From a paper:
Vaccines and therapeutics targeting the critical viral spike glycoprotein (S) must accommodate the mutations in S. Even the highly conserved region that plays a critical role in membrane fusion exhibits up to three mutations in the HR1 region of Omicron variants. To reduce the public health threat of Omicron and future emerging variants, we and others have proposed development of antivirals targeting the relatively conserved heptad repeat 1 and 2 (HR1 and HR2) regions of the spike glycoprotein (S) that drive membrane fusion by the formation of the HR1HR2 postfusion bundle. Although the ~130 residues of the HR1 and HR2 regions are conserved in all prior [name]-[name]-2 variants, a few mutations have reached fixation with Omicron in the HR1 region (Q954H and N969K for all Omicron subvariants, and, additionally, L981F for BA.1).
Previously, we reported an unmodified peptide with an extended sequence composed of 42 amino acids of the HR2 region, termed longHR2_42, that was designed to target these relatively more conserved HR1HR2 regions; this efficacious peptide inhibits infections by the original Wuhan strain and several variants of [name]-[name]-2 with an IC50 of ~1 nM. However, the inhibition activity of this peptide against the Omicron variant was around fourfold weaker in the vesicular stomatitis virus (VSV)-[name]-[name]-2 chimera infection assay and around tenfold weaker in the authentic [name]-[name]-2 infection assay. We hypothesized that this decreased inhibition activity is probably caused by the three mutations in the HR1 region—Q954H, N969K, and L981F—of Omicron BA. New mutations emerged both at antigenic interfaces under heavy selection pressure, such as the RBD, and at more distant but functionally critical sites, such as the S protein fusion core comprised of the HR1 and HR2 regions. These mutations within the fusion core of Omicron lead to major conformational changes of HR2 in the structure of the HR1HR2 postfusion bundle and a decreased activity of a potent HR2-based inhibitor against infection. The N969K mutant structure revealed a similar HR2 backbone displacement as observed in the Omicron HR1HR2 structure with all three mutations —the average Cα atom rmsd for residues 1,162 to 1,170 is 0.7 Å between the N969K structure and the Omicron structure, 2.3 Å between the N969K structure and the Wuhan structure, and 2.4 Å between the Omicron variant structure and the Wuhan strain structure. The comparison with the Omicron and Wuhan postfusion bundle structures illustrates structural rearrangement of HR2 to accommodate the long lysine sidechain at position 969. However, the L981F mutation is probably not required for tolerating the destabilization of the postfusion S by the N969K mutation, since several Omicron subvariants do not have the L981F mutation.
Numbering used by the authors:
A (entry chain D), B (entry chain F), C (entry chain E): 1159 to 1200
D (entry chain C), E (entry chain A), F (entry chain B): 918 to 988
Amino acid sequence: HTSPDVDLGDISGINASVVNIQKEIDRLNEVAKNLNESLIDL
Amino acid sequence: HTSPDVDLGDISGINASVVNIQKEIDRLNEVAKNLNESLIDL
Amino acid sequence: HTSPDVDLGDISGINASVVNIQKEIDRLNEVAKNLNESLIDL
Amino acid sequence: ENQKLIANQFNSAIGKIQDSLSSTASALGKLQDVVNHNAQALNTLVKQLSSKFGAISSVLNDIFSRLDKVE
Amino acid sequence: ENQKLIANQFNSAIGKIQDSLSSTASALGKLQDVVNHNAQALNTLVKQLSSKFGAISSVLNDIFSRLDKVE
Amino acid sequence: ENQKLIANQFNSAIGKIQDSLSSTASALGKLQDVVNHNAQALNTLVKQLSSKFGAISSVLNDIFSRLDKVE
């Protein structure tokens, strides 16, 4: 008798990363706005 | 006696988004094809 | 009596893809380095 | 002669930027495909998970009922 | 006259590359948003999964205990 | 003098597009890394999930067997 406490264990050892490329996106938008200063006006 | 109906409950409140950037990809390909009209022919 | 072996079944039929765009990233970095040969030196 | 140099450098730059835009389009296409596939994967995972958890709950409720009938 | 041609072609190319950079920024923003949302989704999935699996384990341990008390 | 203006504007534009391509490469690299890591995460999640669900099923089959032996 006395059945042991069969513990299923905790699901673990896993996790999802998190992208943080907002610096890069902001830099692209800044460059797209800045290229207006590179237009040629003869 | 009369053990209650222990309901585990439904896994919910979660969901995965869906990217739809095909407009942007098509615009990039259109621009890559259109830059041929920007080549300089002296 | 003789309760049947109720098998839960295996979770399956699913799988996550794997991106392999390292060729494209390397091509972008190569172009960003190559545009230095496109600078104009009058 | 300087105009021919400017024109040649500009055409080379536009060709290189054309290649870069094609590469960016291909990369965004592959990321779109894979993120969408993994989204569908997680969604169907939670669907089949809900089903399996409900089935487990049912067979439990069953064995409590039957063990209560034992007592 | 050739300078006006060079200038016009250059301005057209810069406008097109401006559009391409805006499109790339928008696409990377949408991918960032969705990948982050799916990351949070998988994380909370495993959290609620750990909770549910623990609850299942508990009610099991319970029914072994009670069935042992039956015998 | 107009040629020097054209050359200066072109070099500035190429420098800015160089920065933009470096930024796009970095962003695609980070998205690739994270999407791949989350893909491996979901895959190992379903693997360990299959294992845990099978173990649950086994211990069930066990307790039906033992409760049948009770009756």
